[model samples]
Target: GSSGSSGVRHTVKIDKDTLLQDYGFHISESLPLTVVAVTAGGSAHGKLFPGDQILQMNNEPAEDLSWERAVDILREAEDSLSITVVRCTSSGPSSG
Candidate 1:
């Protein structure tokens, strides 16, 4: 079995009004909604990254949320959006 596979939880706060485009972040369609992209220098740029899985948004669990609902929640914000995500890091060995 491979080693050095771990998950780290993080909470990134994004400023909605200052966002360049859609918070400058994109997520995958898979369950847990993994992060797929982030615009450079944007709201979520330095805070988020690809392969990160979203855990919650604004204290609301994103586990059982619909795609549209999740999108809506992302689009609209009370003031700022506090998103929690789990980042997976694997750095033990490489099979080539």
Candidate 2:
């Protein structure tokens, strides 16, 4: 078996339905919406989980920007980063 190791493993917590609304997706509860982890190489992987709203990264909020833009900040960041996100199964409107 080949263990793929390329980037950091992050555990983002967000609502199920909220993520869907933001990313325009409708996924079942069995599958969690995992956002694409963007790296400095401009490579991205994964899907934004439904109901999952990223709140902060490296102890900083999303700055009212899109996920892609936020990831850009991380990609260009020079220090370690910590991300915080809100997780919900079914809730109100989306926050992106």
Candidate 3:
């Protein structure tokens, strides 16, 4: 019952993974995309972050495409290029 809020938006692009070591972040298929890791310094460091639910890419709705195809559009649209995402604003509660 708490799908609350309008979510946050972000835009990013990285030529490399930029990951140093690794942060324990989880990722799964999501409309747009989802990050479950608490990523450290990387191309995704601050710009692309954990808990993001990318609802759009290149101004197109991610929900409209399949996983493989969405990634294809993302790559060929320009380069390793831009990543546009909409993240949930709420962290909510933790049972842990």
- The sequence of per-residue lDDT tens digits that candidate 2 reaches over residues 9-60 is 3543222122332222222222232333322212111323334455565555
* C-alpha lDDT of all candidate models, in order: 0.75, 0.39, 0.56
The numbered model that scores best in TM-score is 1
Tens digit of per-residue lDDT, candidate 3, span 44-90: 56766676765665566667754565556544643454556675653
- In candidate 3 the C-alpha lDDT for residue 14 amounts to 45
Better of 2 and 3 by lDDT: 3
For model 1, residues 27-46, the per-residue Cα lDDT tens digits are 77555677888777787877
Off by over 4 Å in 2: 1-51, 91-96
Model 3 segments more than 4 A misplaced: 1-4, 18-27, 30-32, 74-78, 91-96
Give the CA lDDT, 0 to 100, for residue 39 in model 3: 53
Structure candidate 3, residue pairs in collision: 25-37, 26-36, 26-37, 32-54
Indicate the residue-level lDDT of 67 in model 3: 56
Q: Model 2 reaches what TM-score against the true structure?
A: 0.34
**Model 3 lDDT, residue 15, Cα:** 42
Best by lDDT: 1
